[PDB]
Design a protein around this nucleic acid. Structure first.
Lengths: 91, 98
DNA sequence: AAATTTGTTTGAGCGTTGAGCAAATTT
DNA sequence: AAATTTGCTCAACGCTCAAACAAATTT
């Protein structure tokens, strides 16, 4: 029922899936903790970069470099894809 | 005096390594793994919303956690997120955060 | 009572988009 | 050699944005 999950291990060596969104939640909970109220500025772009890079990487690998297939799988325009790829020095 | 912290170690997650030992790894990698397991089970439909899928999956808790941190204050939330206040109100409505 | 925040409109401009076509590349 | 992909144009339409204000609220 939930499509994007990660693997976890408990203290019984049982492996169990957990939605990726809980990882994001954790990472932010931690981040917010580590700064005793210093100020945050571009949290949207920080998280977005952290997420877009590996998404591009994975689909480019899964489609063997084929930007057309990649763009189609992703639901975004091919020029947009070329744009994001360039943004991260992936070309 | 200050040790470098690269951008992939800013947002991190607890993991267990090959030596049964707790250790942080980048959120990046969580995303990679989630996508790897997505692909693994993709036997064998077509996909065309992967971007919005991942986007929703990550925007929802980001909005969640910031609204918790600014105790409901949308102005502060927008400020730390670096997006405009109107678009923040928009995203919040999108995820039923009202 | 003052300061801030929300909720709401502006319209400026940046960004996604499709389509289209030849050179390059893959099948 | 046929089929696909790539790199690259363009201008429509959508989205993001700062700036306003009053009403509501937090302080």
């Amino acid at each position: 029922s939930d499509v994007l999950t990660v693997s976890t291990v408990n203290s019984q060596d049982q492996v169990t899936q957990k939605p990726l969104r809980d990882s994001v939640k954790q990472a932010l909970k931690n981040y917010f903790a580590q700064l005793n109220g210093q100020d945050v500025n571009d949290l949207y772009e920080l998280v977005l970069a952290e997420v877009e890079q590996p998404l591009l990487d994975m689909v480019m690998q899964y489609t063997r470099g084929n930007q057309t297939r990649a763009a189609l799988m992703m639901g975004i325009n091919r020029g947009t894809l070329r744009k994001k790829l360039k943004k991260y020095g992936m070309n």
